Design an enzyme around this catalytic site. Structure first.
Site, PDB file in Angstrom:
ATOM      1  CB  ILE A 135      -2.882  -4.198  -5.669  1.00 35.16           C
ATOM      2  CG1 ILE A 135      -2.421  -3.023  -6.527  1.00 35.16           C
ATOM      3  CG2 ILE A 135      -3.361  -5.346  -6.561  1.00 35.16           C
ATOM      4  CD1 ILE A 135      -1.019  -3.202  -7.129  1.00 35.16           C
TER       5      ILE A 135
ATOM      6  CE  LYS B 149      -0.300  -7.541  -0.724  1.00 36.37           C
ATOM      7  NZ  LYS B 149      -0.073  -8.454  -1.877  1.00 36.37           N
TER       8      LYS B 149
ATOM      9  N   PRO C  98       0.750  -1.267   0.000  1.00 35.23           N
ATOM     10  CG  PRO C  98      -0.073  -1.068   2.152  1.00 35.23           C
ATOM     11  CD  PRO C  98       0.442  -2.087   1.181  1.00 35.23           C
TER      12      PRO C  98
ATOM     13  CG  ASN D 160     -11.416   9.387   0.885  1.00 35.84           C
ATOM     14  OD1 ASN D 160     -12.393   9.244   1.622  1.00 35.84           O
ATOM     15  ND2 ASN D 160     -11.142  10.534   0.270  1.00 35.84           N
TER      16      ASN D 160
HETATM   17  C1  4MT Z   1     -19.748  14.887   3.206  1.00 34.49           C
HETATM   18  S1  4MT Z   1     -21.169  14.756   4.088  1.00 34.49           S
HETATM   19  N1  4MT Z   1     -18.585  14.172   3.580  1.00 34.49           N
HETATM   20  C2  4MT Z   1     -18.546  13.469   4.824  1.00 34.49           C
HETATM   21  C3  4MT Z   1     -18.495  11.978   4.482  1.00 34.49           C
HETATM   22  C4  4MT Z   1     -17.387  11.664   3.505  1.00 34.49           C
HETATM   23  C5  4MT Z   1     -17.714  11.325   2.174  1.00 34.49           C
HETATM   24  C6  4MT Z   1     -16.716  11.020   1.267  1.00 34.49           C
HETATM   25  C7  4MT Z   1     -15.392  11.045   1.670  1.00 34.49           C
HETATM   26  O1  4MT Z   1     -14.395  10.715   0.757  1.00 34.49           O
HETATM   27  C8  4MT Z   1     -15.061  11.379   3.002  1.00 34.49           C
HETATM   28  C9  4MT Z   1     -16.066  11.689   3.913  1.00 34.49           C
HETATM   29  C1  4MT Z   2       1.545  -1.772  -0.951  1.00 35.11           C
HETATM   30  S1  4MT Z   2       2.252  -3.304  -0.903  1.00 35.11           S
HETATM   31  N1  4MT Z   2       1.775  -0.915  -2.053  1.00 35.11           N
HETATM   32  C2  4MT Z   2       2.612  -1.325  -3.138  1.00 35.11           C
HETATM   33  C3  4MT Z   2       1.699  -1.584  -4.339  1.00 35.11           C
HETATM   34  C4  4MT Z   2       0.768  -0.431  -4.646  1.00 35.11           C
HETATM   35  C5  4MT Z   2      -0.610  -0.590  -4.423  1.00 35.11           C
HETATM   36  C6  4MT Z   2      -1.479   0.447  -4.711  1.00 35.11           C
HETATM   37  C7  4MT Z   2      -0.988   1.638  -5.214  1.00 35.11           C
HETATM   38  O1  4MT Z   2      -1.866   2.672  -5.508  1.00 35.11           O
HETATM   39  C8  4MT Z   2       0.395   1.806  -5.433  1.00 35.11           C
HETATM   40  C9  4MT Z   2       1.259   0.760  -5.150  1.00 35.11           C
END
Ligand code: 4MT
Ligand code: 4MT
Ligand code: 4MT
Ligand code: CL
Ligand code: CL
EC number: 5.3.2.1
Lengths: 114, 114, 114
Positions: B64, B32, B1, B97
């Site tokens: 992933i 990972k 990640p 997120n």
């Molecule tokens: C508006 S009410 N946002 C609060 C909930 C939310 C929605 C989407 C993301 O990405 C974060 C937080």
């Molecule tokens: C965690 S092992 N990240 C390395 C692979 C990866 C996964 C997702 C994104 O967006 C970038 C790289």
């Protein structure tokens, strides 16, 4: 497309002309007019890659279409190449996230592209 | 990640070793290898959460696979815990997120993971 | 929702009340309490839009629901309007990426919204 780079490489190591070079290379790679292409470079960032603070970069490419298996490999070669050449970042310390955007989910000039 | 945190907390409040701890803890949480984990901390940001400028954070975790209902709750407990204990940000002022990336849409080392 | 704007407009040109204005206007636009809404403004960025370094903005709006063809067209007018007046950015130099998030993929307060 729009392309964003976040990197721990210092601002002074970003070459004059780098944004223009990215714009032109992406226009060629995607066949899109440079007039719509957006580029964004963010140096001096507090980052680690594999627990190391050696030069690295986290990137994203958003596009409406022109995203796929083979196309993404070609973009990755192109963009890691530029980052290696211009910012002296090793390709194995770069991630590039690709996003195929629905035209209805991209806003521009008081509407969307849908 | 890869994990990114944007916060209005100043840089001086980010403790020595914080990027290392994030790397280590995310490796443990996802199973990972830490060598592939990227972490990005952006302090001193112009931000508000609920119209208040008290300490807050906006974060993203891209992976992933390893993304889902229960996993995401576990990550949120971990990451809010770390933001509270190390940066003194209340958990109710943190959004994270989560993104489940297709390997074909992640570039690395001149290619993609597809 | 949460709203992020990256711009090459200098920090001194960002009005002190801009984050609160965005909060309130988005609350009205989405029918959500302002206490839920998070806003993030990142000025002084190194950016180009169509090869030009005139003021521009790259934005994102994430929301759990309240995302779709018509809603996004309306948000685009709202946001282009605010960026135009408060940051003096031409609306044809603004991109806004819209994201409809699953509640299970949004972390908050040690958990997720699912
Ligand atoms: C508006 S009410 N946002 C609060 C909930 C939310 C929605 C989407 C993301 O990405 C974060 C937080
Ligand atoms: C965690 S092992 N990240 C390395 C692979 C990866 C996964 C997702 C994104 O967006 C970038 C790289
Ligand atoms: C390349 S032509 N970009 C301009 C259109 C676009 C595509 C995708 C996103 O996220 C923003 C703008
Ligand atoms: Cl296509
Ligand atoms: Cl809805």
């Amino acid at each position: 497309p729009m392309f964003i780079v976040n990197t721990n490489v210092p601002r002074a190591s970003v070459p004059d002309g780098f944004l223009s070079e990215l714009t032109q290379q992406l226009a060629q790679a995607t066949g899109k007019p440079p007039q719509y292409i957006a580029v964004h470079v963010v140096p001096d960032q507090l980052m680690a890659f594999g627990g190391s603070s050696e030069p690295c970069a986290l990137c994203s490419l958003h596009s409406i279409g022109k995203i796929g298996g083979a196309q993404n490999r070609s973009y990755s070669k192109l963009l890691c190449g530029l980052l290696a050449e211009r910012l002296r970042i090793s390709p194995d310390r770069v991630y590039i996230n690709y996003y195929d955007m629905n035209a209805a989910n991209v806003g521009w000039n008081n509407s969307t592209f849908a």
